[PDB]
Amino acid sequence: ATPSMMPQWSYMHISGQDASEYLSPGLVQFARATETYFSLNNKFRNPTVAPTHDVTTDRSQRLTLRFIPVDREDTAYSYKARFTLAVGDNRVLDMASTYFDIRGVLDRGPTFKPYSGTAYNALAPKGAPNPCEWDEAQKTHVFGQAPYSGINITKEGIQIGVEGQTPKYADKTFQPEPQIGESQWYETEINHAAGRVLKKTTPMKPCYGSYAKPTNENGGQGILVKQLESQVEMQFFSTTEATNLTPKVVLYSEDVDIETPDTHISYMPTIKEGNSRELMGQQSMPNRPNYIAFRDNFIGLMYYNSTGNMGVLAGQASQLNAVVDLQDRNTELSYQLLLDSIGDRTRYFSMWNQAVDSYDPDVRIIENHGTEDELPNYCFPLGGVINTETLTKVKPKTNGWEKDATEFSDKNEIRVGNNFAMEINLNANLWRNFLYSNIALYLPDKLKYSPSNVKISDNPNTYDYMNKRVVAPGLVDCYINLGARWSLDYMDNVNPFNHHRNAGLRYRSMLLGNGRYVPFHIQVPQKFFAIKNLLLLPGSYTYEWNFRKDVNMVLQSSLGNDLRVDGASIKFDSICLYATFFPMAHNTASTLEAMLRNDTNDQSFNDYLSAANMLYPIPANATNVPISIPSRNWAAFRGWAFTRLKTKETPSLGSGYDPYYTYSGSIPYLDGTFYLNHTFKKVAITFDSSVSWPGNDRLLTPNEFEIKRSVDGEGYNVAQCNMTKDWFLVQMLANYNIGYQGFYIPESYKDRMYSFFRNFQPMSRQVVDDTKYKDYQQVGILHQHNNSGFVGYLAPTMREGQAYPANFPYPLIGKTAVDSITQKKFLCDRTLWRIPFSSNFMSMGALTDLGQNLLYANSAHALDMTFEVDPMDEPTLLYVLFEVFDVVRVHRPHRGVIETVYLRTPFSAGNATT
Amino acid sequence: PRPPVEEPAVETVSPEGRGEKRPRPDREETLVT
Amino acid sequence: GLRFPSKMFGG
Amino acid sequence: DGSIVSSYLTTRMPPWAGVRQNVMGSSIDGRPVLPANSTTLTYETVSGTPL
């Protein structure tokens, strides 16, 4: 109301002084003394005031810009989009606000199943057939059902009701509906029933998983044939001993377009084609759930570290590329480990598709508590009782009894004794459904076997192979390692992230949708560290980038199947570069421009991984792995970090297209989902072909880094596992500076997701001893008959057998506990075995004391590291991080000039030869 | 990202932002680091 | 202390 | 009714689509677009043919 609002903004403390300034100096001195026991802090209003001038412009200027591609290109294997990243005068652009808005259509292929179970008749039994017809030696047999109860039956069909006096009969296209039957529980008489039965030309499927498309508006499915009229014939049935004749059951025969779009047959009884009686025993099993989606943080779209497909950021005057990418850099993993350190990695950010690959901890490490099934769980009939007998009311005489038929009827359904019931163990069935769906179906393929009478694919990287390999439920049944927190030895070397409980890929698949055909709209971040946080000064810059079209790289399936064979395809419609400018004032952004063009104000960046990446191949079942770095100035060396990979699961980057890479699961090289850490025995590091590192009698075994042991005579293991005491000391000092003043649980901010202690899980179980137990008999999976007559044999099919005392496993408890031996191991996922190049294995700075040592800085030393690993029957890799200082310094001296100097030490990418 | 620091050069860790017992909730008063 | 600014909705 | 239309204060027309009238629109190639009163314009819907 007042032209100068300041005298009453200062009075009410809207704009003015802090409470340290407007209060009396004795009250401020009082409130600081009593602050811990009598708070006067919130009793006084403290104003905060935004700056008016020289912060935000008043001119017409956009926050977000839209950059059309100047020069786009669609290869059959990649996509290239070239832009003009024009930063105008008195404007600054942080390249973190820049991203690519990619549109297109994603085809997930026929092998995508985003849900466990089936969509159609899931409550049906798996052996329950449809109402089907067949031929025997030829007569056409009918096995059907007539649930509807009408009024009368003539040759026109069943009478569903009247319209006045005219009998209005059932419309044969959709009536009688297969969902409508009796509503009462007691089996009253139906003299005029009807139902629907599939014809003999319709192929016989089980009810579980059966779908036919509806061919009219009223939902009545049936093949329309041109003459466009449905052929639904009526089939009248009567009593066997009745053959006047009145028909009792009318079955509307029909041809449907029947299909099982999300199930498969787990038991084919007959190899022959055509309908038969034996095909009522075929049993349907749901297909394995396959989550096909873009990777976490959009790994695999963008060509990083492929210098043949290297992107461009250069000014349009010079067009000299300021991006100098390298093949022994890992820009994807440097961005996966960066987001763990500066943020909560458990959270989900849908815009960058930031949903971390995370297995379920019950599935990886089986913590088998048994089942809480002390009470029997019974099912009961519809009216509580079915086997009542007929009795007659009897009144006493005036010993003596006589019939009372005046008030009570002579027929009374009265049950004598307990009612009928059947018993099911519910908690065991929920736990046996858990272990089979999550663990037994994810076993290695050497454990499984081919189904009988089912055509299976020959390519093992096809989903049709992985779906149909039938696995015995007795391998992982509800009694495996009872009371042992023990991951299976079969399941250690199997990727836990290729699973349908991978909650990241579970989230990233549903973020696109549930269908095969997904038109997507994605925002892909920039990960190259020199241009990831770069603040561009004004100028005209070209900004060119290569995108992948490889469906084994841009997509992630939860089984790891070859998505090129499995019909997955991606098509890019258009890509737009967006860039959000801060609306800075044109004199402030001219001062900031002029300050940041000095050669002392150069923006310098560092890759978060900061490592040289060397994949050393390991042959199949090869225990010893010798590597060799020939000769180098080892100045500014930080340390090592290593993890075994798989050659099947790791693509050779630098190649723009690998036609022999038949895998679309989690790539541990790119996302940080490392899981083969436990397969290391020892590391022997010897500098200069003579000097063992660290030397100095540092370790209890001073010549090498013993990571784990089988033979432990001298007693050097930690954590009730087989990890040694030297190696647990190093790994707690490398990550946490913990170990010289006692081992303790590190703080929650140092113990991130990809760290050691978050993921180190020690385990122990007891198995039977074949050397001490006297009555030991090796019983294979063919002859183990626990749950003998209540469980299907070697199959998820129907039960078979008799009730009988089990023979497997041997009891480890009780008075008859067998002679048992302890097997110890550990699993430590998601992490890299860090060995820091420090004289006390501690992090006292990023540039360590041995990297500054005059031994390694003024001389050239050889390096001969000798890894010893567990044998694996698969060609595996070895991913050693040679930790360096991958540092860029960026100079922009004039408008549109972008000069960068890259340098990493020791493993530099430029010497006098280049 | 970095704990608070005084500059007496030498570089001295500052004790501000640490947790204390307070009769009133500490988020409405201070920033707790 | 007394220098901490007052809690308001959105600023 | 007998009353005067319009006796209320008229706020001027917003210059964007879906406000001016509630007639069934049309796409750029002639496909029928439902009016702005429809429940199907509370989400977005996108079509795409695969490769």
Side-chain angles (χ1 to χ4, degrees), chain A residues 810-853:
Chain A
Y810 294 92
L812 299 172
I813 59 170
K815 66 180 182 180
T816 60
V818 302
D819 290 328
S820 63
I821 56 168
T822 296
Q823 290 181 353
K824 292 182 180 180
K825 72 181 182 182
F826 65 98
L827 261 62
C828 191
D829 292 330
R830 291 176 184 172
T831 193
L832 296 157
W833 293 116
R834 295 185 184 275
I835 306 173
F837 185 67
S838 180
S839 58
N840 51 0
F841 295 107
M842 300 183 76
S843 179
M844 296 182 288
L847 181 51
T848 60
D849 52 352
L850 291 179
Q852 290 177 349
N853 196 1

Tab-separated table of all heavy atoms in Angstrom, chain A residues 810-853:
chain	number	residue	atom	x	y	z
A	810	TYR	N	20.961	-86.750	4.119
A	810	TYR	CA	21.302	-87.355	5.391
A	810	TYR	C	21.054	-86.345	6.511
A	810	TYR	O	21.191	-85.136	6.308
A	810	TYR	CB	22.753	-87.810	5.391
A	810	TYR	CG	23.055	-88.940	4.429
A	810	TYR	CD1	23.481	-88.674	3.137
A	810	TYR	CD2	22.899	-90.269	4.807
A	810	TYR	CE1	23.752	-89.691	2.250
A	810	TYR	CE2	23.175	-91.299	3.922
A	810	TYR	CZ	23.599	-90.999	2.644
A	810	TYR	OH	23.874	-92.008	1.752
A	811	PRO	N	20.650	-86.810	7.692
A	811	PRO	CA	20.360	-85.879	8.782
A	811	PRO	C	21.640	-85.312	9.358
A	811	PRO	O	22.587	-86.043	9.655
A	811	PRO	CB	19.630	-86.750	9.810
A	811	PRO	CG	19.186	-87.945	9.059
A	811	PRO	CD	20.256	-88.178	8.050
A	812	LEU	N	21.668	-83.993	9.499
A	812	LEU	CA	22.784	-83.311	10.120
A	812	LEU	C	22.520	-82.964	11.574
A	812	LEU	O	23.411	-82.431	12.238
A	812	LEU	CB	23.111	-82.030	9.347
A	812	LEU	CG	23.516	-82.257	7.897
A	812	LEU	CD1	23.618	-80.930	7.202
A	812	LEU	CD2	24.820	-83.017	7.810
A	813	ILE	N	21.320	-83.242	12.078
A	813	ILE	CA	20.933	-82.912	13.444
A	813	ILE	C	20.378	-84.149	14.133
A	813	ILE	O	20.333	-85.235	13.545
A	813	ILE	CB	19.898	-81.773	13.472
A	813	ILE	CG1	18.652	-82.171	12.682
A	813	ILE	CG2	20.490	-80.492	12.940
A	813	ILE	CD1	17.494	-81.219	12.847
A	814	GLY	N	19.948	-83.993	15.377
A	814	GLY	CA	19.342	-85.082	16.107
A	814	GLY	C	20.367	-86.024	16.703
A	814	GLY	O	21.578	-85.797	16.662
A	815	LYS	N	19.853	-87.112	17.278
A	815	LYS	CA	20.732	-88.126	17.843
A	815	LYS	C	21.402	-88.965	16.766
A	815	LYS	O	22.446	-89.571	17.027
A	815	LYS	CB	19.954	-89.031	18.803
A	815	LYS	CG	18.892	-89.886	18.134
A	815	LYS	CD	18.159	-90.764	19.130
A	815	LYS	CE	17.137	-91.644	18.429
A	815	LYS	NZ	16.412	-92.523	19.384
A	816	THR	N	20.833	-89.010	15.561
A	816	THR	CA	21.396	-89.756	14.446
A	816	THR	C	22.033	-88.843	13.409
A	816	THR	O	21.924	-89.099	12.206
A	816	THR	CB	20.321	-90.628	13.798
A	816	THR	OG1	19.262	-89.795	13.310
A	816	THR	CG2	19.764	-91.615	14.809
A	817	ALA	N	22.677	-87.770	13.856
A	817	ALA	CA	23.360	-86.865	12.944
A	817	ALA	C	24.601	-87.539	12.381
A	817	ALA	O	25.368	-88.168	13.112
A	817	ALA	CB	23.738	-85.575	13.663
A	818	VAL	N	24.795	-87.400	11.073
A	818	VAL	CA	25.876	-88.077	10.370
A	818	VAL	C	27.189	-87.353	10.635
A	818	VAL	O	27.199	-86.242	11.176
A	818	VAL	CB	25.575	-88.149	8.866
A	818	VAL	CG1	24.259	-88.861	8.644
A	818	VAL	CG2	25.537	-86.758	8.272
A	819	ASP	N	28.303	-87.981	10.273
A	819	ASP	CA	29.608	-87.338	10.380
A	819	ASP	C	29.713	-86.257	9.315
A	819	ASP	O	29.763	-86.555	8.119
A	819	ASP	CB	30.717	-88.372	10.225
A	819	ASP	CG	30.798	-89.309	11.406
A	819	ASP	OD1	30.490	-88.871	12.533
A	819	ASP	OD2	31.153	-90.486	11.207
A	820	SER	N	29.754	-85.003	9.746
A	820	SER	CA	29.632	-83.871	8.846
A	820	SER	C	30.885	-83.010	8.880
A	820	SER	O	31.543	-82.885	9.916
A	820	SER	CB	28.402	-83.028	9.195
A	820	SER	OG	28.511	-82.472	10.492
A	821	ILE	N	31.208	-82.413	7.731
A	821	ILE	CA	32.395	-81.585	7.569
A	821	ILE	C	31.984	-80.195	7.100
A	821	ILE	O	31.040	-80.042	6.318
A	821	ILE	CB	33.412	-82.217	6.596
A	821	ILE	CG1	32.773	-82.514	5.240
A	821	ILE	CG2	34.005	-83.463	7.211
A	821	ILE	CD1	33.753	-82.862	4.161
A	822	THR	N	32.694	-79.184	7.583
A	822	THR	CA	32.346	-77.798	7.314
A	822	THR	C	33.002	-77.321	6.027
A	822	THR	O	34.226	-77.402	5.877
A	822	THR	CB	32.762	-76.905	8.483
A	822	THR	OG1	32.026	-77.280	9.650
A	822	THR	CG2	32.490	-75.446	8.171
A	823	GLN	N	32.183	-76.832	5.101
A	823	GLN	CA	32.645	-76.156	3.897
A	823	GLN	C	32.433	-74.660	4.076
A	823	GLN	O	31.310	-74.217	4.330
A	823	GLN	CB	31.900	-76.654	2.661
A	823	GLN	CG	32.252	-78.061	2.251
A	823	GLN	CD	31.503	-78.496	1.017
A	823	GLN	OE1	30.616	-77.791	0.540
A	823	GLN	NE2	31.874	-79.646	0.474
A	824	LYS	N	33.507	-73.892	3.949
A	824	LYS	CA	33.461	-72.448	4.095
A	824	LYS	C	33.769	-71.775	2.767
A	824	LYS	O	34.621	-72.237	2.004
A	824	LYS	CB	34.460	-71.965	5.144
A	824	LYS	CG	34.135	-72.379	6.553
A	824	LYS	CD	35.156	-71.813	7.509
A	824	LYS	CE	34.847	-72.207	8.933
A	824	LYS	NZ	35.859	-71.643	9.858
A	825	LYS	N	33.073	-70.674	2.506
A	825	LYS	CA	33.342	-69.834	1.351
A	825	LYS	C	32.757	-68.458	1.623
A	825	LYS	O	32.101	-68.230	2.642
A	825	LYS	CB	32.753	-70.419	0.065
A	825	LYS	CG	31.250	-70.339	-0.007
A	825	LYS	CD	30.743	-70.959	-1.283
A	825	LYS	CE	29.247	-70.842	-1.382
A	825	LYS	NZ	28.750	-71.501	-2.614
A	826	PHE	N	32.995	-67.539	0.695
A	826	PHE	CA	32.418	-66.208	0.754
A	826	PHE	C	31.991	-65.808	-0.646
A	826	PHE	O	32.547	-66.278	-1.637
A	826	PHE	CB	33.408	-65.186	1.342
A	826	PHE	CG	34.636	-64.956	0.497
A	826	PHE	CD1	34.714	-63.872	-0.360
A	826	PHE	CD2	35.732	-65.795	0.600
A	826	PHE	CE1	35.835	-63.657	-1.127
A	826	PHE	CE2	36.859	-65.581	-0.164
A	826	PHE	CZ	36.911	-64.509	-1.025
A	827	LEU	N	30.989	-64.939	-0.717
A	827	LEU	CA	30.579	-64.291	-1.956
A	827	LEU	C	30.583	-62.789	-1.745
A	827	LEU	O	29.960	-62.290	-0.804
A	827	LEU	CB	29.196	-64.763	-2.414
A	827	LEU	CG	29.110	-65.839	-3.495
A	827	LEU	CD1	29.738	-67.159	-3.108
A	827	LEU	CD2	27.658	-66.051	-3.815
A	828	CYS	N	31.285	-62.071	-2.620
A	828	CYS	CA	31.450	-60.626	-2.492
A	828	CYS	C	31.187	-60.004	-3.861
A	828	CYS	O	32.117	-59.781	-4.638
A	828	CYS	CB	32.839	-60.298	-1.971
A	828	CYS	SG	33.066	-58.586	-1.488
A	829	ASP	N	29.924	-59.700	-4.142
A	829	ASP	CA	29.525	-59.210	-5.451
A	829	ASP	C	29.870	-57.733	-5.612
A	829	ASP	O	30.392	-57.086	-4.705
A	829	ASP	CB	28.028	-59.419	-5.659
A	829	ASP	CG	27.656	-60.877	-5.765
A	829	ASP	OD1	28.490	-61.671	-6.241
A	829	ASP	OD2	26.529	-61.229	-5.366
A	830	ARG	N	29.630	-57.220	-6.820
A	830	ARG	CA	29.565	-55.797	-7.161
A	830	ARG	C	30.858	-55.019	-6.921
A	830	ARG	O	30.851	-53.792	-7.049
A	830	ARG	CB	28.438	-55.091	-6.405
A	830	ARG	CG	27.036	-55.467	-6.795
A	830	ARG	CD	26.086	-54.734	-5.880
A	830	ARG	NE	24.693	-55.085	-6.112
A	830	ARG	CZ	23.696	-54.692	-5.327
A	830	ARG	NH1	23.943	-53.953	-4.256
A	830	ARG	NH2	22.455	-55.053	-5.601
A	831	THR	N	31.965	-55.668	-6.578
A	831	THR	CA	33.138	-54.933	-6.136
A	831	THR	C	34.378	-55.393	-6.888
A	831	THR	O	34.386	-56.410	-7.586
A	831	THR	CB	33.365	-55.074	-4.624
A	831	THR	OG1	34.338	-54.113	-4.201
A	831	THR	CG2	33.884	-56.449	-4.291
A	832	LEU	N	35.436	-54.610	-6.718
A	832	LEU	CA	36.725	-54.817	-7.354
A	832	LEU	C	37.744	-55.037	-6.249
A	832	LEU	O	37.722	-54.320	-5.242
A	832	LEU	CB	37.084	-53.595	-8.198
A	832	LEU	CG	36.144	-53.324	-9.371
A	832	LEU	CD1	36.211	-51.875	-9.786
A	832	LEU	CD2	36.523	-54.213	-10.538
A	833	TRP	N	38.615	-56.026	-6.413
A	833	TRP	CA	39.581	-56.322	-5.364
A	833	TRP	C	40.689	-55.280	-5.370
A	833	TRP	O	41.694	-55.440	-6.067
A	833	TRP	CB	40.186	-57.710	-5.532
A	833	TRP	CG	39.284	-58.869	-5.349
A	833	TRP	CD1	38.939	-59.784	-6.289
A	833	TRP	CD2	38.576	-59.230	-4.159
A	833	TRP	NE1	38.092	-60.717	-5.752
A	833	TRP	CE2	37.844	-60.392	-4.445
A	833	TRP	CE3	38.497	-58.687	-2.876
A	833	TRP	CZ2	37.045	-61.019	-3.496
A	833	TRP	CZ3	37.704	-59.310	-1.940
A	833	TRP	CH2	36.989	-60.460	-2.254
A	834	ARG	N	40.539	-54.240	-4.566
A	834	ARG	CA	41.480	-53.136	-4.569
A	834	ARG	C	42.742	-53.507	-3.801
A	834	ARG	O	42.673	-53.939	-2.649
A	834	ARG	CB	40.830	-51.888	-3.973
A	834	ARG	CG	39.685	-51.385	-4.819
A	834	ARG	CD	39.112	-50.078	-4.322
A	834	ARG	NE	37.958	-49.677	-5.120
A	834	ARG	CZ	38.037	-48.999	-6.261
A	834	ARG	NH1	39.219	-48.648	-6.751
A	834	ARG	NH2	36.934	-48.677	-6.918
A	835	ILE	N	43.888	-53.361	-4.459
A	835	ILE	CA	45.189	-53.434	-3.800
A	835	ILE	C	45.856	-52.079	-3.987
A	835	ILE	O	46.405	-51.818	-5.067
A	835	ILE	CB	46.082	-54.536	-4.383
A	835	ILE	CG1	45.393	-55.889	-4.386
A	835	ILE	CG2	47.320	-54.662	-3.556
A	835	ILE	CD1	46.205	-56.948	-5.102
A	836	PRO	N	45.844	-51.194	-2.994
A	836	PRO	CA	46.369	-49.845	-3.212
A	836	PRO	C	47.887	-49.839	-3.252
A	836	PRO	O	48.555	-50.574	-2.522
A	836	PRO	CB	45.837	-49.066	-2.005
A	836	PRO	CG	45.719	-50.087	-0.946
A	836	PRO	CD	45.350	-51.376	-1.622
A	837	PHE	N	48.433	-49.005	-4.132
A	837	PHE	CA	49.882	-48.865	-4.269
A	837	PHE	C	50.358	-47.816	-3.266
A	837	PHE	O	50.788	-46.711	-3.598
A	837	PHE	CB	50.246	-48.521	-5.707
A	837	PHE	CG	51.717	-48.482	-5.981
A	837	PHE	CD1	52.474	-49.634	-5.929
A	837	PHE	CD2	52.330	-47.302	-6.366
A	837	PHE	CE1	53.820	-49.601	-6.200
A	837	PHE	CE2	53.672	-47.267	-6.645
A	837	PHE	CZ	54.418	-48.417	-6.561
A	838	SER	N	50.236	-48.194	-1.999
A	838	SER	CA	50.592	-47.363	-0.868
A	838	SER	C	51.426	-48.201	0.086
A	838	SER	O	51.266	-49.420	0.175
A	838	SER	CB	49.345	-46.815	-0.166
A	838	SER	OG	49.690	-45.997	0.934
A	839	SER	N	52.327	-47.531	0.798
A	839	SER	CA	53.299	-48.217	1.638
A	839	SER	C	52.701	-48.791	2.916
A	839	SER	O	53.369	-49.582	3.589
A	839	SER	CB	54.437	-47.257	1.963
A	839	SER	OG	53.935	-46.101	2.601
A	840	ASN	N	51.469	-48.421	3.264
A	840	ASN	CA	50.770	-48.998	4.405
A	840	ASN	C	49.364	-49.456	4.035
A	840	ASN	O	48.536	-49.666	4.926
A	840	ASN	CB	50.730	-48.005	5.569
A	840	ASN	CG	50.224	-46.639	5.159
A	840	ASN	OD1	49.885	-46.407	4.004
A	840	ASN	ND2	50.160	-45.727	6.117
A	841	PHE	N	49.093	-49.603	2.736
A	841	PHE	CA	47.823	-50.000	2.130
A	841	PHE	C	46.666	-49.077	2.483
A	841	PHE	O	45.508	-49.492	2.405
A	841	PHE	CB	47.439	-51.445	2.477
A	841	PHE	CG	48.369	-52.474	1.915
A	841	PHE	CD1	49.249	-53.149	2.738
A	841	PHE	CD2	48.338	-52.791	0.570
A	841	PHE	CE1	50.101	-54.101	2.227
A	841	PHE	CE2	49.188	-53.741	0.054
A	841	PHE	CZ	50.070	-54.398	0.885
A	842	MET	N	46.940	-47.832	2.850
A	842	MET	CA	45.908	-46.895	3.259
A	842	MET	C	45.790	-45.767	2.248
A	842	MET	O	46.718	-45.475	1.494
A	842	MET	CB	46.214	-46.314	4.638
A	842	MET	CG	46.297	-47.344	5.730
A	842	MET	SD	46.570	-46.595	7.335
A	842	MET	CE	44.935	-45.961	7.654
A	843	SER	N	44.628	-45.123	2.250
A	843	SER	CA	44.355	-43.993	1.371
A	843	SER	C	44.629	-42.715	2.152
A	843	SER	O	43.769	-42.225	2.887
A	843	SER	CB	42.922	-44.036	0.852
A	843	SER	OG	42.657	-42.927	0.009
A	844	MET	N	45.836	-42.182	1.997
A	844	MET	CA	46.213	-40.913	2.592
A	844	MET	C	46.170	-39.775	1.584
A	844	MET	O	46.759	-38.719	1.825
A	844	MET	CB	47.607	-41.020	3.209
A	844	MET	CG	47.696	-42.008	4.352
A	844	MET	SD	49.339	-42.065	5.074
A	844	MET	CE	50.238	-42.907	3.781
A	845	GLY	N	45.487	-39.969	0.475
A	845	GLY	CA	45.440	-39.018	-0.616
A	845	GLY	C	45.349	-39.759	-1.931
A	845	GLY	O	45.660	-40.942	-2.034
A	846	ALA	N	44.899	-39.042	-2.962
A	846	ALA	CA	44.738	-39.671	-4.269
A	846	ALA	C	46.080	-39.941	-4.928
A	846	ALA	O	46.211	-40.907	-5.688
A	846	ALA	CB	43.869	-38.807	-5.178
A	847	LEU	N	47.080	-39.114	-4.651
A	847	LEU	CA	48.444	-39.341	-5.113
A	847	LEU	C	49.234	-39.944	-3.962
A	847	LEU	O	49.648	-39.230	-3.045
A	847	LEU	CB	49.068	-38.047	-5.620
A	847	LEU	CG	50.492	-38.139	-6.157
A	847	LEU	CD1	50.581	-39.235	-7.166
A	847	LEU	CD2	50.856	-36.840	-6.821
A	848	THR	N	49.451	-41.256	-4.025
A	848	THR	CA	49.970	-42.021	-2.906
A	848	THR	C	51.450	-41.722	-2.674
A	848	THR	O	52.120	-41.075	-3.481
A	848	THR	CB	49.768	-43.515	-3.146
A	848	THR	OG1	50.466	-43.905	-4.332
A	848	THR	CG2	48.297	-43.831	-3.316
A	849	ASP	N	51.957	-42.210	-1.544
A	849	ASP	CA	53.344	-41.965	-1.173
A	849	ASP	C	54.337	-42.785	-1.982
A	849	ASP	O	55.472	-42.341	-2.168
A	849	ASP	CB	53.542	-42.234	0.318
A	849	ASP	CG	53.038	-43.598	0.737
A	849	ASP	OD1	52.402	-44.282	-0.087
A	849	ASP	OD2	53.285	-43.988	1.896
A	850	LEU	N	53.951	-43.966	-2.458
A	850	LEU	CA	54.822	-44.712	-3.352
A	850	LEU	C	54.744	-44.214	-4.784
A	850	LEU	O	55.692	-44.418	-5.549
A	850	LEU	CB	54.497	-46.205	-3.310
A	850	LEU	CG	54.837	-46.949	-2.024
A	850	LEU	CD1	54.425	-48.404	-2.122
A	850	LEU	CD2	56.315	-46.831	-1.724
A	851	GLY	N	53.642	-43.567	-5.167
A	851	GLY	CA	53.589	-42.920	-6.464
A	851	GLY	C	54.454	-41.682	-6.531
A	851	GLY	O	54.894	-41.284	-7.612
A	852	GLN	N	54.707	-41.055	-5.384
A	852	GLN	CA	55.634	-39.940	-5.273
A	852	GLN	C	57.035	-40.369	-4.885
A	852	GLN	O	57.910	-39.506	-4.755
A	852	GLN	CB	55.128	-38.948	-4.238
A	852	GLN	CG	53.922	-38.204	-4.668
A	852	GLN	CD	53.412	-37.294	-3.595
A	852	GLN	OE1	53.843	-37.358	-2.450
A	852	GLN	NE2	52.517	-36.409	-3.967
A	853	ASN	N	57.257	-41.660	-4.677
A	853	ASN	CA	58.556	-42.147	-4.244
A	853	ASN	C	59.563	-42.021	-5.379
A	853	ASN	O	59.231	-42.222	-6.548
A	853	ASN	CB	58.440	-43.599	-3.794
A	853	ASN	CG	59.630	-44.059	-2.988
A	853	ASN	OD1	60.557	-43.296	-2.733
A	853	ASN	ND2	59.608	-45.318	-2.580
